[PDB]
Assembly symmetry: D2
């Protein structure tokens, strides 16, 4: 009943670690997360954002354990077992165990240019299977998760499904909502493809990786943690989180008949704050335009250095940074110290020298300069095509400016790149996550929940849940030529208006 | 050079008080503000909201002084004088000196039922004139505000105008915006009705009481202070405020030619957070439904007790609580103490006993039972392109629905006999139902060391809901309904059906889309 | 299982109110605590210290409930019952229900000059008996505290004893601890004078009002709350409190054999922070020298107004402020609004006019001028191994020194004519002048799943000063001395010379050693 | 007039960066500080203590600039120049630029076992001379710090002296205090060995590296920053810091006649909080006993791996981790990623495999176990105390082993005795507050004073320093409580038998 450890945490005060979760924390696979920054290169703009994936993972664990333990005590008819509490807890603890260095770059532009095979969710699942089948881990968890191969393997399957599964996405297939009760009961019964548990435990899928509306404990932890680290204020607070946890129940989904996590309708504004806070932290922190400029230098360095950096894998074979996802043991040797590996390399191949040049430009702040931005409604597109169209129209406009003002190709020779940021609440361009959250009325002590009225987002939210930012990165030389820089900024705005993305 | 006092403050750490602002703080008129709760009856739901008008006024002073002092150092060409800095600072310090007890009730339902003459802004102006003409204050301020009676009087006029004036409201009238630029200048030249300063100091009107967009330092202080006291998180933070103060300049308004306070365009999101935070604190804190129920009991007590409670005015005449606004001296004897004056009264007139009964209901938590609520778009109040009409129609439709429920379920009038009242709250961002304050804030581009712009029409479409205001409609019934949930649930069902049946709301859903 | 209310609190985030504690909160007697400032007149120096006794009492309740509920889950062999948990919780909630207005002045100088009979702990016990015997409260608590009159009466007796009892003070008497342990057990057996529970529940007496070492939840709450409201940093933090709650057990006292609350020995520094934080907040906040100056004006006003202010008691008899402690009903009409009652009085008796004059001096900041201070070891009060004697000797020596200064510098009696008063403050850790509270706290070793120990004599020697208490001696003169710094500086010099010349202090130095 | 950058900071909200301080921040030498943890291995106990030397250095800069700028505005008669403000600012920014990886281990046990040449203060001074003599830095600072070689070199000398100099230590030579005014004025005049400024600017030496009483802006920043990161509450708060900055003046030292930073006497409690907060964070955070256990594993790994890890220096020569302090360019390639260099090494030499074994024990939490501790007054004597306690414990365990017939089960137990110095700074006996000058009243030349001898008697324990003596055992004893209990009993009996502890 006493925790093995109580660990100081700056968001919650402390995190309690019960036996045998301590055995998962004290593995090389979990301790690796101390050497991955939660927010990647954001620290080059917000220097206090140097918090690790380790502290996020402990925080996320603490929330998943607290929420399932609260549900078990307030609704004994759910039949939540010690096994359900530990599986859901472990999924929360290990959801993030498979990030590479600078994960969003590693899985994004680096993976795209390199044809990389696996992304962090795939690697998480591989590392979870590796950790849970270690004999010194199985001997500690067997009394909770099962002594038989069948029982233990089902428990491990549930842990990986709580991360990877999307068991409610069928409910949004066209006309599922208008089907008769009969058809519906049968469809839900035969749609159930989860192996680790039956439909009677469907609500656990809302806790760890909530694909339906993004209201998972991972989200709640990183909003609070990343707000505190960045100093950017958000409406979702520690007190907001405690309000949700004091007003949470499992109810029947009126659309599927499955058990779902619901909140008291008096908390709808508190749930809306989760999506609004996500979009705010994306706009101000994670996709800050100077962070984006430095990401382009880091991706070039990783691509140029990638063949030369080698990691020993399972069978003593060496894997390059470009192939490390092909072997879990080699992958586990990678950290954010990849940056220092490049800087300290004694390899004199021209490509290594190019990678070192790019990293040294970051440290001297020799980065691209801002040549304008606008925000736009994703609907006015019908994002890569928008970027290509804006870049082509800007080039035409700069040619016309160059010839009309007789600048002898000074404008036509300017090097610039058009980039985009998706600034959303999660989910799709058009849907606020709050619209897809179930609520209950009254103070229950079986309850059927409801989704909000169509009026709620009309009265409280902008028409679209997502905006795109289109921005221009120029050669740093343009910093000393404001008259040229001003023409590129003018061209971006005219290209936006000429495509009907912006009104003048 | 050095402040006379440095006073601890929980929002900023400290407030610096330079000479001779200390002399205004140390007056009976300013010290009275210790005994007025900034958020009225909110403390009966949020018990930590017991902060005074005194701490808000010191905070608001500190921001006005910091902002004008920053502008004077950053933009010497503005010709900001010590007299402009002190007048703007004092207007910020004293803007709230004229509140009555439980101000929003005092100036709202109490004033309406009583036909009260003056509201807090009127009383502030009267008390400002009284403070600044005290011999012991004039002797301290004459060296800054003017050694001639005429000069001193002009400074006092400026202080009161920074609170009461609306010098930019002409810019929105007629089609002033479409007028030939030259005629615009002539109109602006002849519209200038401010006596205490010329149009070259127009930007000072943005600092204290900003009628054009509500972005004054009074608003910035209360959002931070009321958020911290309530525990309700908002996007406008102390760091947001410091960002605005590090990115503020005076620029020319492209629509009037007048000097205005502007912010860097990189801070547009930080400015939008002011209006969004105001609406959030109204929805969650100031117009909390249980606060509104207890306000109805407090107003009944004040109306019933009002004739019996007397305050000595100028020349020793007694004024009732219902007439105190007619004499500044009698008004200055009023505080939130009025609640204890009623409770402790030895008057046995039936009306005093009714006031005591109502206050004892608050203390025993004998308050109305919640019988449902909904939010609505103000536009849905009519079918053409009336909050009171919404309230009357909802109440009439609920009565009809409860009659049908009563007869269909054979409840022998137990539903039809339920007493309930329908109320509304206006939950807005500070201006009109349709306009986000951010649309009416001027910004600048680049890192200047001159002409501002208003946001594109796209900004509100991409970032804000269609309407800046929402209405909440809610039902209060007899407290006894707490012990009869089956009956209470029918009334809550009737409110939802009534909203839908009058086209005020569309229903809660069985699927997202 | 579910709380009736969850109430926002700025120290803990929230306080959970289980049924039927909500019924005690919603009484006129508990709601009165909204209108008593927790730190009295401190707000005239620290304007954010306007938090009420109501918020402190809810916080204190929340800690007592959490601690006893944690002990019941961690140590089922203690046989903690629902009745023990609710009695201890209620004692914590209501310990502070009996404070008067400006309690420390009311029970201190006002009571001394007036010969007042009862102090706040006496009134708390009277008000607790009144609340728990209300028919609408007994109907809610009878199912937990007892369905027979005898059982209910025993529960109410336990609630009052957890506040007033001192069951461990015998352990320090005589040479009790050198006694043969057999005789010790029989003495402890026959010393047990508590009626509401047996000695098997002795550990509950450490929770609410801890006379033995002051480590009660009331102390833990006010240190956190008063630190946050004042902005004065202390070592005892919210995280320190959670550390104690995660490392707390009931063990056997090795000196008495009674069950006592103990902490893990790894938390000894966290416990020492409680007494050190108390002394710091006394020195910096509660006994701030400008607060003490304004207290002298407030006590004079209360004494002068006291006969004229009347409160209706049981059977409709009127009690003056000087007699209100003689009738619980009359006492319950008093709040901090007594200050406004004086200010607004229409009585023209010269004594009422004197009270109004004193309160107007506070509002205009017409307070005494500081004319020096020093700190001293209480041991230096006599030459053998008398705060009043220190104060008399300092004042007499200063007078002689000022006479010599006046004649030597030919100031024609301008120094000799200065009016001043010498005062003292006791700045201690809560027990006696010589004992650090931590020395009297039991600890345990290891991670048990039984006999505690007191700290080694080395702990205090290595970590604490020799004395747990210091005295501050300070001088208050006429406010006019603010405008005559050359005279003021001579008086400050005289205080330092007077302290040195009486061997109360050694002088400020020209080199560290 | 406007800062070039305003950078978010979790302690102050923001740090303003004026031109041309931005040019020093945007160097590889300063950016390296992002990859050195301020608190070393503390994060293995307090996982939120992962803040870098970079954020501490920016904070320390911001305080030094604010304090000297405030003094310049409040006391124009000090003749503080733009050059004094920028030299003092830069010394504060760069004081910490020369730490190695896991600095306290690197300069402590690693250096002792390796005979390492230089410590971090020496390397700071080398790196400051390298940065300030870069042509693209000199071209930016020449207009403030001097266009002539002589002027520029004087300014660079002042920056390095504000870090290394101890110009007031002569004031504590026996009998200096009792000398006549004549002798004193002459002694102070001829003791002045600072080259970068004259004695009229002595007060600047109190700002950056305060060797007299430790009341420098470096100390004030790390107490606030490390308290916030650790979640360990202290009496020194951000509001305490603002109180000091609102009540600070330069006054004449009554003992030397030199100008010194002084605080209003109403702030004596607020100054005492600095030393008390330092001792608290040492006891609870920096010298946490589990941190110490993991330090012994990390030192062994660094010693075993040190010959194999190589860094390219100035002339393309390779320097081992054990020699990197011999070449500033090789030193600048070192970071906390040395831990990952060991873990990922393909070298199969037995010593490299031993280093990897030790680091993998840290990650699996296979660390020594606690076998007791006590606190002691240093006057009852630290290396000798550790050796005596270990020898007496060994004798006591032999007597226990034979008397209880345990056939050498006690005598075979492997354990190590360690010590921690838990102090307020300075010496075992002196509270820093006793050595701080204060002033009286509200001045607008003032002579300051030191506190009465009574102040520490009434407010502080008799000694300013305590020692903690503790035992680390083989992790096997975690499963042998009866054996572990005898070692704990032996430590206590050894303390009592040497009169360090009383019954
Ligand atoms: Mg441990
Ligand atoms: Mg003062
Ligand atoms: Mg309620
Ligand atoms: Mg920039």
């Amino acid at each position: 009943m006493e925790p093995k450890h109580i660990i100081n945490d700056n968001v919650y005060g402390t995190v309690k670690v019960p036996r045998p979760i301590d055995k998962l924390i004290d593995t090389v696979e979990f301790q690796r997360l101390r050497h991955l920054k939660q927010t990647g290169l954001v620290y080059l703009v917000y220097p206090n954002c140097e918090h690790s994936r380790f502290v996020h993972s402990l925080g996320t664990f603490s929330l998943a354990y607290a929420l399932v333990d609260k549900l078990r005590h307030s609704q004994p008819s759910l039949n939540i077992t010690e096994s359900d509490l530990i599986c859901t807890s472990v999924a929360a603890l290990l959801r993030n165990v498979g990030h590479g260095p600078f994960s969003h770059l590693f899985d994004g532009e680096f993976a795209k240019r390199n044809g990389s095979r696996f992304k962090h969710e795939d690697m998480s699942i591989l590392i979870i299977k590796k950790i849970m089948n270690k004999p010194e881990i199985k001997s500690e968890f067997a009394c909770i998760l099962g002594e038989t191969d069948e029982e233990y393997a089902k428990s491990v399957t549930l842990i990986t499904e709580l991360i990877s599964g999307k068991p409610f996405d069928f409910q949004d297939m066209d006309g599922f909502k208008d089907l008769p009760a009969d058809v519906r009961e049968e469809t839900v019964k035969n749609e159930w493809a989860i192996i680790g548990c039956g439909p009677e435990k469907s609500f656990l899928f809302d806790v760890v990786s909530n694909s339906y509306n993004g209201h998972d404990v991972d989200k709640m932890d990183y909003l609070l943690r990343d707000s505190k680290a960045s100093g950017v204020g958000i409406t979702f607070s520690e007190s907001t989180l405690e309000r949700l946890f004091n007003h949470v129940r499992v109810v029947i989904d009126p659309n599927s008949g499955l058990k779902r996590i619901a909140y008291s309708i008096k908390c709808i504004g508190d749930l809306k704050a989760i999506g609004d806070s996500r979009q705010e932290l994306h706009s101000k922190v994670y996709q800050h335009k100077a962070v984006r400029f430095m990401e382009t230098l880091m991706v070039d360095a990783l691509i140029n250095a990638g063949d030369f950096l080698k990691y020993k894998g399972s069978n003593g074979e060496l894997y390059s940074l470009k192939n490390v996802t092909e072997d879990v043991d080699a992958f586990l040797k990678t950290t954010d110290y990849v940056e220092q590996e490049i800087l300290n390399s004694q390899i004199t191949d021209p490509k290594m020298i190019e990678a070192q040049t790019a990293l040294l430009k970051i440290q001297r702040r020799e980065i691209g300069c801002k040549l304008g931005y606008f925000e736009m409604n994703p609907e006015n597109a019908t994002a890569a095509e928008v970027v290509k169209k804006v870049g082509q129209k800007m080039k035409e406009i700069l040619e016309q400016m160059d010839d009309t003002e007789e600048m002898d190709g000074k404008l036509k020779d300017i090097q610039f790149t058009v980039m985009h940021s998706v600034l959303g609440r999660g989910l799709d361009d058009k849907t606020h996550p709050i619209e897809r959250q179930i609520f209950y009325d009254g103070k229950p002590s079986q309850v059927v929940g409801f989704y909000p009225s169509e009026d709620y987002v009309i009265n409280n939210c902008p028409r679209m849940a997502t905006k795109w930012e289109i921005f221009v990165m120029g050669d740093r030389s343009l910093r000393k030529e404001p008259l040229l820089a001003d023409r590129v900024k003018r061209a971006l705005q005219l290209a936006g208006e000429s495509e009907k993305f912006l009104t003048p």
